[PDB]
């Protein structure tokens, strides 16, 4: 009966708001102010939210969605039918929540120590080393140490985690946890669509890889780089080799072009974490999008004073939104600040929907918003207007190369993480083979090799945040494809003509309008609709990303040919 379904979702909304807000508060308070007491308040709230999820989920499952007419109420009820972990029996729920905590804590407190010397944390110490050291042995110390200390220590938890996340999935009508995660896209063709998108980016990635490999051969020596092989995984300027832009200085196409180091300029001109978020906020409002409320500035944690990994927080009351980031003053982190502020923008845009529909059109959309703005921020024009820099085709290629080292290098990495996890969850990778299958994919997709042979008890996936924190990853792959589609469309709405990479949407109210109407849908409609509102068509497409990078593909092709490069590796 329609009226009874309608009433049921009104009640679910009122009560979810209250319970989720209380849970979010306790999760914040442990993420920022670890305390035995904040971790104890967190443990209580886990029990509260489970009980509410079990209560309304059991009620939701009594309705026959097949016979409901109103499509909103049908959709909401369908979501509430999925209890997630609250479907578990009590013992197993307890054990699962404790495993998640233990894994997340283990990762966040791990350190890598010199004997009779200092102990280094991932952020900022080890990331700095991976970004700035140009010495094979120093990079290897950090790369291997982080795996020895974080990765190996997550292993004891992972099999039971898999058992329990899968058990919950099956109790909610899925075959395993990857199935449940894939379901968030509501796209039966998802695996093949993504495969196709990846395949389209292979020429650009293989040409970037070959060019970077040649430059590493020049710096690290012929004895350490095989011009026909995979690249050692510790040399790309980043702990996971997921973005390569910190080795720009080793691969600059045209050295004779001046670029100012923005880090020096940011530091010397008195930039702070606070100032970095004010610039992000100011860009959103330039587009006519919403400012973050006064409360955001009061309650956010914008520096290390904790779980440091950058994250945006909805407190499910339509007024309180926060970022938690251990911000360092540099351009890499200004982009991370923009990313996080696009999550906040989304929260604010869909804040008046029912709480069950307060998500992105799909998870990739949530990830893409901030990155779209950052694309304009990162342009040489934009950096100059911020006083962080002082024409030529040589400048163009240099800029494209910088952008490519992040955006194109990330494509195979972002694709492979959940390829691994889907096969763990479906049972085709058992714990005996976790690590070998990870490295098979690191070779197949990224063309990387481990600098030190892996050994019994290694668990390199565990050294990447998203694995112990149980955060799906395919969202980031989708993000990097679709953010270029949004840029293309917003630039076209902004009246930009000429090379897409020269576009800066700063101050375009027209661009901000396309984004706002789509964000306002939250999760109320199939995501193709939001895709079409923004772009004029309903598909995920690598066309826009290829269009952005076309000058670089052509440059890289001619350069690799000149040196007789053999693209790929065995
Ligand atoms: C199908 O139902 C939605 C939801 O209606 C709201 O939620 C119900 C549970 C109940 O509380 C209703 O009184 C609410 O209206 C309808 O959506 C809304 O429509 C109103 C005006 O028509 C609009 O102002 C709201 O923003 C809409 N909210 C949404 C989309 O969540 C919807 O119109 C119903 N379908 C039709 C057209 O009959
Ligand atoms: C903040 C708020 O009150 N929003 C509600 C929402 O109600 C209305 C809202 O009054 C108007 C204007 O703000 O916009 C259309 C509706 O969304 O109702 C939601 C339940 O459907 C509730 O979650 C939300 O907090
Ligand atoms: O008991 C339950 O069913 C749930 C409990 N929790 C407790 C709060 C940890 C959840 C937490 C979720 N997230 C926390 C915010 N970031 C990631 C997602 C979630 F999506 C679902 C659930 C439940 O279903
Ligand atoms: O921010 C948070 O803490 C939560 C966020 N989410 C939403 C997903 C982002 C949740 C979703 C839950 N669901 C239960 C199962 N069916 C609907 C989804 C949940 F129980 C708890 C939470 C949170 O605590
Ligand atoms: C891309 C992803 N970003 C984020 O988690 O905020 C990562 O950092 O691996
Ligand atoms: Cl690794
Ligand atoms: Cl996802
Ligand atoms: Zn994000």
XYZ file of C-alpha atoms and ligand atoms in Angstrom:
693
model
C 0.000 0.000 0.000
C 1.437 3.365 -1.140
C 0.487 5.348 1.971
C 2.165 2.866 4.309
C 5.359 2.782 2.234
C 5.318 6.603 2.134
C 4.951 6.904 5.933
C 7.676 4.296 6.441
C 10.241 6.296 4.486
C 9.277 9.521 6.278
C 10.044 7.793 9.592
C 13.292 6.283 8.256
C 14.422 9.756 7.208
C 13.718 11.400 10.580
C 15.452 8.643 12.562
C 18.417 8.025 10.193
C 19.268 11.714 10.328
C 19.496 11.522 14.144
C 21.370 8.186 14.391
C 23.827 8.762 11.533
C 24.634 12.260 12.850
C 25.447 10.801 16.286
C 27.576 8.090 14.674
C 29.417 10.595 12.420
C 30.245 12.740 15.509
C 31.870 9.836 17.357
C 33.717 8.709 14.198
C 35.105 12.239 13.753
C 36.148 12.445 17.437
C 38.155 9.206 17.142
C 39.603 10.044 13.688
C 40.922 13.403 14.994
C 41.328 13.031 18.831
C 42.222 9.322 19.288
C 41.548 8.534 22.962
C 40.543 5.248 24.693
C 37.327 7.135 25.540
C 36.627 8.394 21.959
C 37.253 4.854 20.691
C 34.845 3.633 23.412
C 32.133 6.159 22.417
C 32.731 5.001 18.802
C 32.127 1.394 19.894
C 28.756 2.293 21.474
C 27.635 4.191 18.348
C 28.510 1.170 16.143
C 25.945 -0.773 18.174
C 23.336 2.007 17.892
C 23.550 2.406 14.128
C 23.531 -1.395 13.564
C 20.360 -1.755 15.649
C 18.663 1.025 13.669
C 19.874 -0.452 10.374
C 18.582 -3.900 11.436
C 15.249 -2.421 12.618
C 14.347 -0.378 9.514
C 15.940 -2.950 7.155
C 13.714 -5.711 8.569
C 10.690 -3.386 8.143
C 11.828 -2.387 4.623
C 12.050 -6.068 3.537
C 8.352 -6.677 4.307
C 7.340 -4.401 1.400
C 7.096 -5.876 -2.123
C 8.987 -3.321 -4.136
C 7.668 -5.111 -7.273
C 4.200 -3.704 -6.478
C 5.071 -0.088 -5.597
C 4.150 2.711 -7.979
C 5.969 5.849 -6.740
C 9.542 5.389 -7.985
C 11.308 7.496 -5.302
C 9.705 5.516 -2.463
C 10.411 2.246 -4.312
C 14.072 3.256 -4.709
C 14.510 4.374 -1.077
C 12.875 1.197 0.195
C 15.111 -0.923 -2.022
C 18.249 0.697 -0.564
C 17.034 0.289 3.039
C 16.528 -3.444 2.326
C 20.307 -3.773 2.127
C 21.431 -3.886 5.792
C 25.195 -4.127 4.947
C 27.076 -5.407 8.052
C 23.994 -5.121 10.281
C 22.729 -8.290 8.548
C 25.485 -10.229 10.325
C 24.798 -12.140 13.554
C 25.982 -10.310 16.681
C 29.318 -12.099 17.226
C 30.343 -11.626 13.587
C 29.242 -7.982 13.483
C 31.317 -7.243 16.579
C 34.335 -9.052 15.076
C 33.985 -7.286 11.729
C 33.822 -3.808 13.310
C 36.918 -4.662 15.429
C 38.795 -5.950 12.343
C 38.050 -2.731 10.426
C 39.281 -0.662 13.405
C 42.440 -2.783 13.900
C 43.348 -2.602 10.177
C 42.726 1.178 9.963
C 44.629 1.848 13.227
C 47.553 -0.431 12.203
C 47.962 1.472 8.933
C 47.606 4.908 10.482
C 50.246 4.410 13.235
C 52.874 2.410 11.298
C 56.384 3.943 11.190
C 59.677 3.074 9.526
C 62.732 3.510 11.750
C 66.470 3.936 11.230
C 68.357 2.058 13.997
C 69.594 4.552 16.596
C 67.885 7.196 14.410
C 64.483 8.767 13.736
C 61.254 6.880 12.981
C 59.342 8.156 9.938
C 55.602 8.245 9.377
C 53.979 7.945 5.959
C 52.744 11.559 6.021
C 54.671 13.756 5.680
C 58.025 11.982 6.131
C 58.001 8.989 3.746
C 55.935 10.700 1.076
C 58.506 13.547 1.094
C 61.303 11.001 0.611
C 59.484 9.308 -2.280
C 58.794 12.767 -3.855
C 62.262 14.372 -3.582
C 64.998 11.719 -3.185
C 66.872 10.924 -6.384
C 68.910 8.078 -4.865
C 68.013 4.459 -5.640
C 68.951 3.168 -2.159
C 67.142 5.978 -0.223
C 63.989 5.428 -2.239
C 64.258 1.693 -1.761
C 64.633 2.090 2.037
C 61.341 4.008 2.226
C 59.458 1.849 -0.326
C 60.412 -1.472 1.254
C 60.207 -0.228 4.865
C 56.640 1.035 4.420
C 55.659 -2.376 3.014
C 57.528 -4.193 5.806
C 55.830 -2.145 8.537
C 52.322 -1.376 7.174
C 51.746 -4.110 4.564
C 53.010 -7.107 6.544
C 51.053 -6.009 9.661
C 47.698 -5.878 7.811
C 48.088 -9.486 6.590
C 46.946 -11.142 9.815
C 43.534 -9.380 9.505
C 42.756 -9.632 5.777
C 41.408 -13.215 5.297
C 38.894 -12.838 8.155
C 37.950 -9.373 6.843
C 37.207 -10.956 3.480
C 35.211 -13.739 5.090
C 33.054 -11.251 6.999
C 32.499 -8.597 4.302
C 31.476 -11.419 1.929
C 29.187 -13.030 4.533
C 27.361 -9.658 4.922
C 27.096 -9.285 1.128
C 25.529 -12.754 0.733
C 23.037 -12.020 3.524
C 21.979 -8.935 1.528
C 21.369 -10.884 -1.709
C 24.807 -10.477 -3.416
C 27.233 -13.258 -4.332
C 30.225 -11.536 -2.661
C 31.399 -8.084 -1.562
C 32.701 -7.021 -5.008
C 29.321 -7.779 -6.490
C 27.782 -5.524 -3.857
C 30.306 -2.761 -4.574
C 29.862 -3.002 -8.346
C 26.090 -2.703 -7.773
C 26.504 0.936 -6.716
C 26.843 1.870 -10.436
C 23.502 0.145 -11.376
C 25.144 -0.802 -14.678
C 25.073 -4.497 -15.705
C 27.649 -3.774 -18.458
C 30.069 -2.135 -15.961
C 33.031 -4.520 -16.255
C 33.072 -4.389 -20.076
C 32.471 -0.622 -20.210
C 35.445 -0.032 -17.908
C 37.620 -2.535 -19.835
C 36.846 -0.623 -23.039
C 37.708 2.746 -21.434
C 41.028 1.339 -20.172
C 41.897 -0.042 -23.618
C 41.361 3.380 -25.160
C 44.002 4.913 -22.850
C 46.639 2.250 -23.645
C 48.446 4.124 -26.473
C 48.880 7.239 -24.346
C 49.975 5.219 -21.274
C 52.396 2.963 -23.187
C 54.008 6.015 -24.837
C 54.251 7.903 -21.491
C 55.721 4.786 -19.839
C 58.363 4.348 -22.545
C 59.385 8.011 -22.374
C 59.623 8.039 -18.584
C 61.511 4.694 -18.657
C 64.096 6.248 -21.027
C 64.519 9.262 -18.665
C 64.948 6.963 -15.645
C 67.575 5.044 -17.647
C 69.478 8.318 -18.039
C 69.360 9.174 -14.292
C 69.487 5.760 -12.513
C 71.869 4.119 -14.999
C 71.655 1.398 -17.667
C 72.426 -1.286 -15.078
C 69.196 -0.398 -13.162
C 66.696 0.219 -15.996
C 65.748 -2.253 -18.747
C 64.615 -0.252 -21.807
C 62.447 -3.246 -22.800
C 61.177 -4.070 -19.335
C 58.965 -2.938 -16.472
C 59.978 0.107 -14.408
C 61.105 -0.457 -10.767
C 58.167 0.585 -8.565
C 60.143 2.943 -6.236
C 61.306 5.462 -8.818
C 58.109 7.304 -9.830
C 58.002 9.961 -7.070
C 55.103 8.378 -5.132
C 54.837 5.530 -2.634
C 52.500 3.462 -4.874
C 53.698 4.808 -8.250
C 50.082 5.894 -8.846
C 50.974 9.432 -9.933
C 54.356 10.362 -11.371
C 54.412 14.172 -11.311
C 57.086 14.428 -8.601
C 59.661 13.161 -11.176
C 58.780 15.953 -13.651
C 62.277 17.428 -13.155
C 63.782 14.146 -14.508
C 61.597 14.007 -17.668
C 61.059 17.708 -18.620
C 60.543 17.755 -22.446
C 61.934 21.303 -22.880
C 64.329 22.242 -20.008
C 64.936 25.615 -21.655
C 61.380 26.605 -20.737
C 61.171 28.420 -17.364
C 58.670 27.129 -14.851
C 58.811 28.493 -11.287
C 58.611 25.911 -8.506
C 55.223 26.634 -6.986
C 56.280 25.049 -3.655
C 58.917 27.739 -3.085
C 56.455 30.440 -4.173
C 53.630 29.152 -1.985
C 55.871 28.901 1.104
C 57.666 32.205 0.550
C 54.395 34.071 -0.137
C 52.941 32.842 3.165
C 50.405 30.257 1.974
C 48.887 28.117 4.750
C 46.506 25.100 4.845
C 43.799 27.602 5.748
C 44.659 29.794 2.752
C 44.636 26.731 0.451
C 40.989 25.907 1.415
C 39.945 29.571 1.081
C 41.285 29.541 -2.502
C 39.294 26.330 -3.235
C 36.146 27.788 -1.638
C 36.672 30.999 -3.621
C 36.863 29.071 -6.916
C 33.532 27.284 -6.215
C 31.852 30.587 -5.433
C 33.430 32.113 -8.584
C 31.300 29.551 -10.501
C 28.227 30.630 -8.520
C 28.381 27.462 -6.411
C 27.811 27.379 -2.654
C 30.283 28.698 -0.046
C 31.160 26.310 2.806
C 29.214 27.427 5.962
C 30.822 29.375 8.856
C 30.764 26.100 10.795
C 33.137 24.389 8.343
C 35.927 26.826 9.264
C 35.263 26.266 13.000
C 35.201 22.460 13.113
C 37.352 21.267 10.241
C 40.811 19.805 10.847
C 42.901 21.391 8.035
C 46.389 20.447 9.409
C 47.904 17.776 11.686
C 47.300 19.415 15.113
C 45.029 11.017 13.927
C 44.019 9.479 10.626
C 45.734 11.839 8.206
C 44.411 10.654 4.852
C 42.365 13.507 3.389
C 38.574 13.091 3.687
C 35.328 15.047 3.512
C 32.567 14.564 6.128
C 28.762 14.841 6.009
C 27.112 14.876 9.466
C 23.625 14.246 8.006
C 21.941 17.381 9.357
C 22.250 19.621 6.296
C 24.414 22.206 8.142
C 27.633 20.547 9.410
C 30.292 19.570 6.837
C 34.003 19.220 7.523
C 37.323 18.331 5.980
C 39.974 16.321 7.784
C 43.367 16.664 6.086
C 47.015 16.738 7.256
C 47.651 19.522 4.727
C 51.237 20.354 3.634
C 51.850 23.596 1.678
C 52.453 22.611 -1.952
C 50.586 22.316 -5.239
C 49.956 18.560 -4.910
C 48.074 19.278 -1.714
C 46.254 22.330 -3.150
C 44.745 19.859 -5.680
C 43.896 17.439 -2.861
C 42.171 20.348 -1.082
C 40.096 21.027 -4.249
C 39.161 17.348 -4.497
C 37.893 17.377 -0.909
C 36.017 20.629 -1.385
C 34.077 19.112 -4.329
C 32.870 16.377 -1.934
C 31.688 19.177 0.381
C 30.034 20.991 -2.548
C 28.134 17.788 -3.404
C 27.007 17.356 0.267
C 25.651 20.918 0.229
C 23.931 20.534 -3.168
C 21.968 17.366 -2.284
C 21.374 18.330 1.366
C 17.570 18.615 1.052
C 17.042 15.130 -0.469
C 15.997 12.158 1.704
C 19.087 10.783 3.412
C 18.933 7.493 1.429
C 19.430 9.511 -1.787
C 22.270 11.710 -0.404
C 25.069 10.240 -2.495
C 26.658 11.018 -5.876
C 24.930 9.950 -9.112
C 27.533 7.185 -8.843
C 30.698 7.137 -6.600
C 32.849 8.303 -9.523
C 30.767 11.478 -9.799
C 31.450 12.247 -6.110
C 35.213 11.952 -6.759
C 35.174 13.979 -9.985
C 33.729 17.298 -8.875
C 36.719 18.841 -7.086
C 39.196 17.495 -9.643
C 37.320 19.300 -12.426
C 38.024 22.674 -10.742
C 41.599 21.610 -10.035
C 42.188 21.088 -13.793
C 41.708 24.845 -14.286
C 43.686 25.687 -11.133
C 46.687 23.710 -12.403
C 46.916 25.687 -15.681
C 49.975 27.974 -16.116
C 47.602 30.868 -16.663
C 45.809 30.180 -13.382
C 49.014 29.665 -11.398
C 50.334 33.008 -12.738
C 47.177 34.861 -11.533
C 47.851 33.400 -8.067
C 51.370 34.868 -8.330
C 52.926 31.378 -8.113
C 54.492 31.651 -11.641
C 55.904 34.451 -13.844
C 53.052 31.125 -24.718
C 55.225 28.680 -26.657
C 54.403 25.211 -27.895
C 57.381 24.084 -25.750
C 55.571 25.444 -22.669
C 52.421 23.617 -23.828
C 54.141 20.244 -24.109
C 55.849 20.752 -20.760
C 52.475 21.494 -19.135
C 50.743 18.532 -20.798
C 53.600 16.287 -19.656
C 53.160 17.471 -16.054
C 49.413 16.823 -16.200
C 49.934 13.457 -17.909
C 52.340 12.253 -15.193
C 49.384 12.496 -12.779
C 46.268 11.797 -14.859
C 47.453 9.239 -17.399
C 49.787 7.364 -15.041
C 46.885 7.001 -12.578
C 44.670 5.258 -15.116
C 46.209 1.717 -14.920
C 46.732 1.980 -11.153
C 43.119 3.025 -10.472
C 41.886 0.214 -12.732
C 43.934 -2.520 -11.097
C 43.114 -2.053 -7.404
C 39.576 -3.448 -7.572
C 40.467 -5.941 -10.281
C 42.565 -7.474 -7.499
C 39.894 -7.040 -4.812
C 37.022 -8.386 -6.994
C 39.036 -11.626 -7.493
C 39.862 -11.807 -3.791
C 36.188 -11.347 -2.921
C 34.975 -13.853 -5.535
C 37.419 -16.446 -4.180
C 39.644 -16.742 -7.269
C 42.616 -15.224 -5.334
C 43.225 -17.043 -2.047
C 45.427 -15.680 0.766
C 48.392 -17.855 -0.329
C 48.421 -15.891 -3.613
C 47.353 -12.369 -2.505
C 50.788 -10.858 -3.090
C 51.804 -12.681 -6.312
C 48.472 -11.801 -7.936
C 48.886 -8.155 -6.898
C 52.276 -8.042 -8.619
C 50.919 -9.854 -11.729
C 48.490 -6.962 -12.120
C 51.103 -4.315 -11.280
C 53.091 -5.759 -14.231
C 50.171 -6.361 -16.592
C 48.478 -2.928 -16.221
C 51.174 -0.490 -14.983
C 54.340 -2.274 -16.272
C 56.023 -2.022 -12.850
C 58.274 -4.494 -11.038
C 59.194 -4.718 -7.341
C 62.820 -3.522 -6.682
C 63.213 -6.272 -4.073
C 61.791 -9.785 -4.551
C 58.695 -10.242 -2.380
C 58.868 -12.856 0.381
C 56.613 -15.012 2.471
C 54.396 -12.872 4.709
C 54.473 -9.828 2.423
C 51.155 -8.074 1.805
C 51.898 -5.037 -0.332
C 48.170 -4.231 -0.917
C 47.974 -3.663 2.842
C 50.406 -0.697 2.429
C 47.817 1.226 0.412
C 45.248 3.107 2.510
C 42.096 1.965 0.648
C 42.785 -1.727 1.309
C 42.770 -1.810 5.179
C 40.183 1.057 5.245
C 37.847 -0.912 2.939
C 37.229 1.998 0.573
C 36.251 0.970 -2.984
C 38.701 2.116 -5.640
C 37.072 1.817 -9.062
C 35.449 5.207 -8.291
C 38.838 6.886 -8.893
C 39.245 5.259 -12.320
C 35.758 6.432 -13.282
C 36.554 9.872 -11.828
C 39.688 10.398 -13.972
C 37.755 9.498 -17.179
C 34.627 11.540 -16.466
C 36.362 14.624 -14.995
C 37.764 15.278 -18.512
C 34.255 14.910 -19.973
C 32.976 17.495 -17.460
C 35.893 19.829 -18.174
C 35.210 19.586 -21.919
C 31.541 20.373 -21.386
C 32.063 23.140 -18.827
C 34.696 24.771 -21.055
C 32.236 24.628 -23.948
C 29.533 26.193 -21.735
C 32.100 28.806 -20.654
C 32.706 29.801 -24.301
C 36.280 28.486 -24.452
C 37.527 27.835 -27.982
C 40.811 26.216 -29.016
C 42.888 23.585 -27.196
C 40.945 22.044 -24.328
C 44.085 22.073 -22.106
C 44.200 25.929 -22.227
C 40.715 26.204 -20.650
C 40.202 27.860 -17.268
C 36.556 27.968 -16.113
C 37.286 30.399 -13.231
C 34.401 32.840 -12.845
C 32.044 31.044 -15.336
C 28.513 31.026 -13.823
C 27.388 28.976 -16.847
C 29.867 26.204 -16.012
C 28.741 26.193 -12.380
C 25.121 25.860 -13.459
C 25.692 22.626 -15.394
C 27.342 21.112 -12.329
C 24.747 22.321 -9.807
C 21.663 20.891 -11.529
C 23.347 17.471 -11.822
C 24.718 17.453 -8.265
C 21.230 18.371 -6.950
C 19.884 15.009 -8.164
C 22.055 13.190 -5.709
C 21.257 9.498 -6.165
C 17.582 10.003 -7.131
C 18.012 9.074 -10.837
C 20.097 6.649 -12.972
C 23.540 8.223 -13.424
C 23.272 8.495 -17.264
C 20.784 11.322 -16.664
C 23.288 13.387 -14.675
C 25.949 12.538 -17.288
C 23.611 13.956 -19.956
C 22.682 17.141 -18.008
C 26.389 17.956 -17.779
C 27.714 16.822 -21.215
C 24.749 16.406 -23.577
C 25.268 12.627 -23.850
C 24.758 9.644 -21.496
C 27.973 7.598 -21.735
C 31.308 7.325 -19.992
C 33.844 8.153 -22.738
C 37.632 8.514 -22.940
C 37.199 10.908 -25.905
C 37.517 14.066 -23.772
C 40.690 12.862 -22.005
C 42.252 11.879 -25.348
C 41.319 15.287 -26.788
C 43.017 17.081 -23.879
C 46.209 15.009 -24.326
C 46.263 14.819 -28.148
C 49.284 17.218 -28.578
C 51.223 15.084 -26.088
C 50.303 11.770 -27.666
C 51.659 13.131 -30.954
C 54.810 14.551 -29.289
C 55.472 11.322 -27.345
C 54.990 9.170 -30.439
C 57.534 11.181 -32.472
C 60.022 11.238 -29.526
C 59.794 7.514 -28.742
C 60.219 6.668 -32.468
C 63.361 8.832 -32.616
C 64.906 6.716 -29.842
C 63.658 3.422 -31.278
C 61.585 2.696 -28.172
C 59.845 -0.655 -27.877
C 56.521 0.122 -26.140
C 55.423 -2.312 -23.430
C 57.360 -5.066 -21.633
C 57.071 -8.956 -21.503
C 6.743 10.231 -5.513
O 7.114 10.588 -4.183
C 8.041 11.685 -4.148
C 8.381 11.874 -2.704
O 7.408 12.732 -2.100
C 7.809 13.227 -0.853
O 8.101 12.120 0.002
C 6.967 11.296 0.348
C 7.506 10.103 1.107
C 5.999 12.166 1.140
O 6.648 12.666 2.320
C 5.520 13.295 0.227
O 4.633 14.180 0.908
C 6.678 14.101 -0.326
O 6.236 14.962 -1.380
C 7.429 12.931 -4.785
O 8.423 13.961 -4.793
C 8.344 15.294 -4.446
O 7.391 16.154 -5.031
C 7.268 17.438 -4.379
C 6.134 18.168 -5.047
O 5.418 17.282 -5.902
C 8.590 18.178 -4.489
O 8.458 19.473 -3.901
C 9.634 17.327 -3.777
O 10.925 17.908 -3.836
C 9.716 15.930 -4.387
N 10.674 15.151 -3.620
C 11.485 14.173 -4.042
C 11.655 13.990 -5.522
O 12.087 13.475 -3.230
C 7.041 12.590 -6.216
O 6.521 13.716 -6.917
C 6.074 11.411 -6.204
N 5.676 11.141 -7.569
C 4.622 11.729 -8.141
C 4.912 12.819 -9.137
O 3.481 11.391 -7.845
C 16.617 20.885 5.243
C 15.213 20.383 5.061
O 14.302 20.735 5.806
N 15.006 19.537 4.037
C 14.272 18.279 4.117
C 13.336 18.005 2.929
O 12.270 18.898 2.758
C 11.905 19.694 1.597
C 12.470 21.088 1.840
O 11.633 21.716 2.822
C 12.473 21.972 0.588
C 13.233 23.283 0.761
O 14.319 23.207 1.694
O 13.072 21.239 -0.522
C 12.284 20.118 -0.931
C 12.251 19.086 0.197
O 13.464 18.345 0.136
O 12.689 16.750 3.125
C 13.582 15.624 3.187
C 12.695 14.407 3.251
O 12.123 14.162 1.965
C 14.521 15.762 4.382
O 15.482 14.705 4.360
C 15.245 17.105 4.308
O 16.055 17.291 5.468
O 25.591 -1.392 11.109
C 25.421 -1.159 9.894
O 24.657 -1.728 9.098
C 26.320 -0.132 9.292
C 27.191 0.448 10.139
N 28.079 1.376 9.796
C 28.877 1.822 10.934
C 29.171 3.265 11.079
C 30.277 2.293 10.781
C 28.174 1.797 8.450
C 29.109 2.750 8.007
C 29.206 3.139 6.635
N 30.148 4.086 6.192
C 30.764 5.049 7.123
C 31.098 6.350 6.424
N 32.125 6.152 5.377
C 32.060 4.812 4.764
C 30.667 4.200 4.817
C 28.267 2.511 5.763
F 28.237 2.816 4.439
C 27.354 1.597 6.179
C 27.289 1.207 7.523
C 26.309 0.210 7.919
O 25.533 -0.342 7.106
O 28.743 8.858 7.301
C 28.331 7.854 7.916
O 28.724 7.589 9.076
C 27.370 6.879 7.271
C 27.100 6.996 5.927
N 26.289 6.162 5.225
C 26.033 6.408 3.799
C 26.543 5.456 2.765
C 27.144 6.820 2.889
C 25.657 5.096 5.899
C 24.799 4.212 5.224
C 24.179 3.122 5.890
N 23.314 2.247 5.222
C 22.724 1.038 5.816
C 22.392 0.021 4.747
N 21.364 0.524 3.806
C 21.495 1.977 3.576
C 22.908 2.475 3.824
C 24.460 3.004 7.286
F 23.908 2.003 8.029
C 25.273 3.862 7.950
C 25.901 4.926 7.275
C 26.777 5.815 8.022
O 26.977 5.634 9.248
C 42.924 8.769 -5.608
C 42.714 8.545 -4.114
N 42.236 9.808 -3.553
C 41.754 9.905 -2.304
O 41.724 8.691 -1.752
O 41.415 10.940 -1.749
C 44.055 8.082 -3.513
O 44.615 8.935 -2.900
O 44.545 6.942 -3.731
Cl 52.930 -2.210 -4.017
Cl 33.239 2.685 -6.188
Zn 37.428 11.700 -2.804
